[PDB]
Design a protein around this ligand. Sequence first.
Ligand SMILES: *[C@@H]1O[C@H](CO)[C@@H](O[C@@H]2O[C@H](CO)[C@@H](O[C@@H]3O[C@H](CO)[C@@H](O)[C@H](O)[C@@H]3O)[C@H](O)[C@H]2NC(C)=O)[C@H](O)[C@H]1NC(C)=O
Ligand SMILES: *[C@@H]1O[C@H](CO)[C@@H](O[C@@H]2O[C@H](CO)[C@@H](O[C@@H]3O[C@H](CO)[C@@H](O)[C@H](O)[C@@H]3O)[C@H](O)[C@H]2NC(C)=O)[C@H](O)[C@H]1NC(C)=O
Ligand code: 94R
Ligand code: 94R
Ligand code: 94R
Ligand code: 94R
Ligand code: NAG
Lengths: 413, 413, 413, 413, 45, 45, 45, 45
Amino acid sequence: NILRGESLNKSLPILHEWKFFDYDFGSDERRQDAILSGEYDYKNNYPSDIDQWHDKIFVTMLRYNGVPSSLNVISKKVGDGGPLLQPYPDWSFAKYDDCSGIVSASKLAIDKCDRLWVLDSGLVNNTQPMCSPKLLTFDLTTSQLLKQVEIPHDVAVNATTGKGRLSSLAVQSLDCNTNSDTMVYIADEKGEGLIVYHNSDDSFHRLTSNTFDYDPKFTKMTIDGESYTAQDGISGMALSPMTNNLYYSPVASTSLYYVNTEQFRTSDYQQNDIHYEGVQNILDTQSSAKVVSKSGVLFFGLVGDSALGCWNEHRTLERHNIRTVAQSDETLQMIASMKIKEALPHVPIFDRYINREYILVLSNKMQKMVNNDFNFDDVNFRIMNANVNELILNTRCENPDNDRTPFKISIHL
Amino acid sequence: NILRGESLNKSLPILHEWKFFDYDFGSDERRQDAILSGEYDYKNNYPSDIDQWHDKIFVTMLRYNGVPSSLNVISKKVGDGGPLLQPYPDWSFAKYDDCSGIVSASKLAIDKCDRLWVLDSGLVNNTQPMCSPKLLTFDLTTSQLLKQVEIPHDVAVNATTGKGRLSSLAVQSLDCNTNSDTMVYIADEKGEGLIVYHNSDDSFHRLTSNTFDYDPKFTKMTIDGESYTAQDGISGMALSPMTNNLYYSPVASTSLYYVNTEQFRTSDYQQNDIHYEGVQNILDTQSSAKVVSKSGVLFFGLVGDSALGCWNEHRTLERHNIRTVAQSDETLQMIASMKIKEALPHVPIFDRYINREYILVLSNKMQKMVNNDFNFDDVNFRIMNANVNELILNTRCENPDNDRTPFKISIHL
Amino acid sequence: NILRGESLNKSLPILHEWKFFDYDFGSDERRQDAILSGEYDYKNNYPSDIDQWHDKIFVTMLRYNGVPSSLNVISKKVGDGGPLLQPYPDWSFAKYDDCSGIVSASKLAIDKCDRLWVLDSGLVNNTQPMCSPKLLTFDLTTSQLLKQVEIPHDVAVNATTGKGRLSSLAVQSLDCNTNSDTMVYIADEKGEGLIVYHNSDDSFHRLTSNTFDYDPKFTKMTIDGESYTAQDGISGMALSPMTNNLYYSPVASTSLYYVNTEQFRTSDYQQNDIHYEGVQNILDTQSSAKVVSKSGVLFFGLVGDSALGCWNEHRTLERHNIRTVAQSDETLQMIASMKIKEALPHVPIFDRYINREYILVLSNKMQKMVNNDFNFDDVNFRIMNANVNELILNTRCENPDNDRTPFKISIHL
Amino acid sequence: NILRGESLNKSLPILHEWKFFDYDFGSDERRQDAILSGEYDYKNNYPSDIDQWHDKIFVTMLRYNGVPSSLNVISKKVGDGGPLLQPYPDWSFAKYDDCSGIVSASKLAIDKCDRLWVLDSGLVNNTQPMCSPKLLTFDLTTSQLLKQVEIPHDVAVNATTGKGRLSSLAVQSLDCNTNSDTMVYIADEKGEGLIVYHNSDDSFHRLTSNTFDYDPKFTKMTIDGESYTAQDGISGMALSPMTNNLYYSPVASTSLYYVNTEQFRTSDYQQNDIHYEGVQNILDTQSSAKVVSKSGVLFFGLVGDSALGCWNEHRTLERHNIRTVAQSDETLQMIASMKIKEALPHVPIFDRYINREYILVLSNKMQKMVNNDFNFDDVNFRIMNANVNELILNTRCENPDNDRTPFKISIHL
Amino acid sequence: ESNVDVVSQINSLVSSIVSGANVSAVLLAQTLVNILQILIDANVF
Amino acid sequence: ESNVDVVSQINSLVSSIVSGANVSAVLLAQTLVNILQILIDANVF
Amino acid sequence: ESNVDVVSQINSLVSSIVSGANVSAVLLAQTLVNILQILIDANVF
Amino acid sequence: ESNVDVVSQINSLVSSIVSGANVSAVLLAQTLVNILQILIDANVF
Ligand SMILES: *[C@@H]1O[C@H](CO)[C@@H](O[C@@H]2O[C@H](CO)[C@@H](O[C@@H]3O[C@H](CO)[C@@H](O)[C@H](O)[C@@H]3O)[C@H](O)[C@H]2NC(C)=O)[C@H](O)[C@H]1NC(C)=O
Ligand SMILES: *[C@@H]1O[C@H](CO)[C@@H](O[C@@H]2O[C@H](CO)[C@@H](O[C@@H]3O[C@H](CO)[C@@H](O)[C@H](O)[C@@H]3O)[C@H](O)[C@H]2NC(C)=O)[C@H](O)[C@H]1NC(C)=O
Ligand SMILES: C=C(CC[C@@H](C)[C@H]1CC[C@H]2[C@@H]3CC=C4C[C@@H](O)CC[C@]4(C)[C@H]3CC[C@]12C)C(C)C
Ligand SMILES: C=C(CC[C@@H](C)[C@H]1CC[C@H]2[C@@H]3CC=C4C[C@@H](O)CC[C@]4(C)[C@H]3CC[C@]12C)C(C)C
Ligand SMILES: C=C(CC[C@@H](C)[C@H]1CC[C@H]2[C@@H]3CC=C4C[C@@H](O)CC[C@]4(C)[C@H]3CC[C@]12C)C(C)C
Ligand SMILES: C=C(CC[C@@H](C)[C@H]1CC[C@H]2[C@@H]3CC=C4C[C@@H](O)CC[C@]4(C)[C@H]3CC[C@]12C)C(C)C
Ligand SMILES: *[C@@H]1O[C@H](CO)[C@@H](O)[C@H](O)[C@H]1NC(C)=O
């Protein structure tokens, strides 16, 4: 039903791939010293989120014992395992012992203001909170730390359970003029909560609901046959530009919900007022990461079937409309990050001749990380690029099209 | 099943359209004189076949009482009803009273030799044979009649029934060098026969089989609700460049057959030897016209459902594989001609960046012609252009694709 | 004084050169047949006038016994002696036996109407009049004989002496619109007369004066040491576009005269009325050919000194102002034709950045022709091209210049 | 004789011109403060030398009481009097009170190493020595003071007279590779001496001769009628790249001498050994500034006749060969600086199509400065640019030319 | 030049090119000028 | 674009090129557009 | 220039353009030269 | 392409242009390619 027949075994073009992660320390002797000192270990590097800016591919690494730097940009030099990473901006921010630098970069987001938003989980080994979580704003043109904010402890974790790990970050800007009125949403799965931060107000508000909680029935997740158990709440938030709707789905459930950000415009923040609209059990498997294109199409990742599914916002939300586009067991093990970008430079007149939206997907084998069974002789981590219009063409997810031009150009990285 | 859900109400871009057909006699007074003399009547002009050459759109008109010229090229001048036609090459060939000129041009075909092949039905009113049928070869660069051959009477019509009308023409060239070894296939529905003409041998051979005969059960054809009865044999031949297979299907049946042209290479032409391979009743409705692209995809026209269907040659021939791409009651009433062309100039290196094949489809309302109920206040005849790769993308008909380039360009007229 | 010091031994770039003249009869066998029949002889070909049109170099040959064609265009094929000539337009006009074709082309002129004006001397061997002289107008775009006029016998030759040979032709057009009001001037040295032909009136008028007569003192002319005696009248007419003044000088004198064409505008043509303004004995040697550029500079050829001299019309006419630009004994033996052209296409805005006027000069050794002493192992005939502005720069002949642009471009063939 | 007839009243294109000199202090209030403090006075600014680098025009100002900065680059902002100057590199070097900055920049020179050589006269009011003379080497790409050397007192001034003012500076580089072997020549007129500085040896050597001394007979100099008396020695040194000959002429004499730099290659520096080859009294008037182009043409300035003269090195040195090119009383009052540059970027293949050398000449009215009679309502100081090849074309100074290309391009600023 | 006019010119030029007819030089130059002007207006360079 | 304006732009561009400075891309493109438009107006093609 | 090399150059140039980075002039000129040479070899003009 | 060959091609092309004949497109394109290649070799860009 949901799994489309033609989608079977279809893969995506691979922009980059790594057998493992190697860092550009400089000379080979410096790499040897780093390995000897225990700073760098190739068995404890796992990608969390990726992003792109004009020539740069930023990748976030979960802060384990052997991680040299949490946030790294892809460098031109290519190692045997894969392309070499380079600390960003420099090694000064990589030093997290003082906690001045980034401890652990969880997710990334880039707005139209050409600003990089970095979320610091603070957790080390993803289970031990070392330092306070941070929201960092960097200027991508000057490579400087524009702003740094510290998340309050009370809003970060539940007062009852006492545990909380930030998982997803989304940035919305009603107006990115001289003063950017940006409302940042941070979803913490361990706390099963949502945090709304108003940049203008410099205020954090915590919201909780029964929808954010996990379902014990669907905790088990089977990827490529191997099964692992995880108990996490709300994660994978995608904000639709067209409808201003923030979508979400608990990690341990198949139901899909969404909320309207217009309810958050009121400074009142009335508790129990927020109305969450969702459908219960519309998917056979869980959803890992979601992203909404400006055309109005939502892409999500089916973990159990190891596939990519799409849904058109204009059409009704039901199992009939939901369809898959890409299916591959090896190419798409676990989708951890999806980012939709557009071609540049922007020309208003020529937009009719060009399909500008292209999607970047990160695939890392999380079931191997959980069970500590990684074969470093194969390609473990992949980054793929695809064209949205040609990926959703002639399907249920396609938008009403009009062929008004003699030629059409499809653009992807 | 065969009718795909997304294909519903989908239309194609319209290159040209006519409320009725008007000819460019020159001055308005000449048009008035032609109308007064009875040479030109706007109620007796119906398109049969279309073709394109570098700037020209050739259209064939069935020779009725009021037809000024059977074959006409689209001219730059545009009348109120539609773009004006112009006799080709001149008015000398339009004069069919002496029979020197073309009496009635049934079908057209263009080879890679830049030669135009014209089939003369000879029939006037499509029921009365006036002059002998002809095969004409014109040079499209010099606009001269290169060659003219006359079809023998015995091979033209059945000796028993005594009736026969040529319906379909296909041209195959094993080698179009200085001497063109071209085998021309002419399918006559009224005679239920096939004629193979060898240009090198200057020989015509007639072949008949039970497959070429019509089925009385499926004589009735319903277009847009209105139903008409027709009893015709084999028509709509398409020759696949990849497999050298000539496909066909009787007008009054749903079965689809094909033959291999390699059996015709032997000069023996052993009777009852030719093996025709086909499937019985794989379509709900009849097929009007068929065309095979160089990639290996066959497009046919479902008359009853008023749609366009496709089938991939690589995949097995069955109802499961057969799917529709375009469905429209008004836009596609009756598909009388389909031609697949490629973009020019040919560049071998850049072929990976461009989808070159584009299809041209002619739609005329035949059910109105049969019942003599034509509303000349609306758009009766249409010509549409589409891109094959984007039309068959993400369907059963698509070929195994590989996205090896950052950008892809789709080209259609 | 007149001979400038820096001008000594200065030469001009050579566009083309011939040891002798060879014609492109076609195959070598045709050339052999022509030589055997006596039609073609390489010892009796001498250039008279040259002209250029967009790719073509027209050359006129005096009609001797062995001349195949009087008027010939330079062809692409190159013989051992030099580039091969080709009859223009075809061999039909080369056949002068019927007198329908050109007997002997004396001089050429091209107007802004893109028309070629050909003067037919009629004389064979330059001493025997065979057929009547003709004025021919050809269209250089269609290669057709637009018009042909026959000069009356009475105006052609003196009634008293009875001898007359047309030597120089000049074309002036007050308006070259749909009807070209062109006044053609033909100077005959043997008759010592001038003929004014009005194309609109189709009338020829003959004018004579004491200035047109020769001086017996200066009959002897010494070129490169070798001296020959010639008794000829007015020749070498140049019409200044700026001042509408026709300049002339008798072959056997050094005085230089000019007349105003405005006196010829009156249909009266009052005899003895025409006022000729000139200076007596301003040159050490005789002047062969003259040409006036549109800027207002007159170039003439000093036969005795074998040099090229210039005079600015704005400045006063005296020996002080007259100066030489090019001096060379071998390169410039006898200057028989000079034509000043301009670069194309014409762009009004860019004229300030480009010096457009370039001069073409023909050099043939006339003293060798008179004495019948030609060394065919050397380069006898030459065609040279030069840039006028750079040739007259920083001299008495230069016009007041203003360097208003950062860059200046000099153009010559 | 020397004054060519056509050169009369000929002027040169003016790149820039000033009624007076105004500096870009910034805001108008800063200019008002500078004027009030006495730092800036418009009556005490006189140009000494000019130079050009890729977009910059460096101008040197004699250090008087009211001079804000000795060395200034032309800025984009344009004042009412003329284009505004800007201190170079900044105001730090303009502060000469500490003597760290430039006291008085006398002359400038730019080598192929992209280095600026600045000579500091040290004299204030051109009669009082305040600080020691300096040789400064600046990098024109980084705008930094690469090197600074101090000239010894003994070699700077005569031991007997005790007076000496540095007047001319020339830079020669046998090899401008990583280590630049540059021999700098400084001619001091007041000391009537020459100083050779070897950059590799860091050694200064002083040479004197009877030729360097002035002639009392020619002390008086008449410019534009007004006469002033000056007693100065050797000045205006030009080094020929082709012949490696340093030319010179005393200010108060008309004789012209030159020396060969190869004699200076020996580290011995044998006294009275150096052989100076010159001609006595070959000019009617004195020579102010000289410059030698790479083609081999020397340009000098005739002060008395207010003209520009040229001499070809290949031809013999005599009054017959020496000729003038530009003559103008108002445009060229007193030529203080001449620099010959070439077009960029350098393309070896295209050099045949382009005349690359262009000369820049500075004209300031020195006779007005001496007599303190300056009309600030008129254009006092001018900078002119001309093309060398077109300036010397068709004269005695021209080099043997060959027109081997259809088009020639002349380039000047 | 109107934007719709530029779009129509581009659509005609591309159709003429892909059709195989002889493309006129003046039309191609005019289309190039219009496209370059539009790009300049967008500060692409 | 006025003809005098085009002449001034050409004179500035050529001077900047021969001077050796870094020529801006936008100015070069604008000058090229103006020159092509002038050539088209003259029916050069 | 090898055909595969030209294809790689085109793929790198288009990716750099659509990425938004500053495209080097020399690389663009070299790609243009290669494309024009290929078109000339195909008798497009 | 040899440098002398490029010079000869440029000399023929300029002469054909200034003469007024119809300049072939293929020759102009080849000359443009050669000139651009020479400029690239000189690091003009
Ligand atoms: C026109 O003439 C041709 C003969 O040249 C006729 O073709 C023949 O048509 C009959 C049926 O009408 C065929 O009989 C069938 O044979 C198959 C076996 O091949 C058998 O299974 C069927 O039950 C039936 O008996 C016959 O084979 C066929 N001739 C050949 C050579 O194949 C044609 O029918 C004539 N047209 C009309 C309108 O009658
Ligand atoms: C500054 O000091 C220098 C010496 O270092 C002086 O140079 C000397 O000048 C005298 C004339 O004033 C020269 O005498 C002349 O010698 C030539 C032969 O070379 C002779 O033919 C003349 O009749 C005359 O006697 C002397 O040679 C020259 N020194 C050298 C080494 O050449 C210079 O004059 C001093 N400056 C002033 C203003 O006095
Ligand atoms: C066809 C070619 C050359 C490829 C070129 C002409 C195509 C391809 C990509 C197009 C740009 C896509 C994005 C964009 C971004 C958009 O904002 C403007 C158009 C532009 C620049 C397209 C311009 C045309 C491009 C560069 C050869 C290789 C056969
Ligand atoms: C992107 C553009 C300009 C459109 C141009 C660069 C694109 C479009 C069509 C492409 C040709 C298609 C066919 C073909 C036929 C093929 O054989 C060669 C490539 C070619 C000529 C393409 C060249 C590039 C074209 C002309 C603007 C309007 C934004
Ligand atoms: C500098 C170049 C290229 C030479 C080109 C750009 C120069 C030379 C001749 C100029 C034309 C002359 C005539 C004319 C005729 C005039 O009416 C318009 C300008 C034009 C076409 C000039 C255009 C610019 C030309 C072609 C390379 C070889 C270094
Ligand atoms: C003719 C034109 C355009 C002017 C252009 C094509 C001409 C003029 C200057 C030439 C450069 C001079 C210097 C040089 C420096 C030399 O090293 C390379 C040639 C070059 C760049 C010439 C190139 C051709 C130029 C730019 C229009 C205005 C009618
Ligand atoms: C003129 O120059 C040529 C070429 O250098 C030379 O051969 C000839 O002798 C020169 N003429 C004279 C009279 O010296």
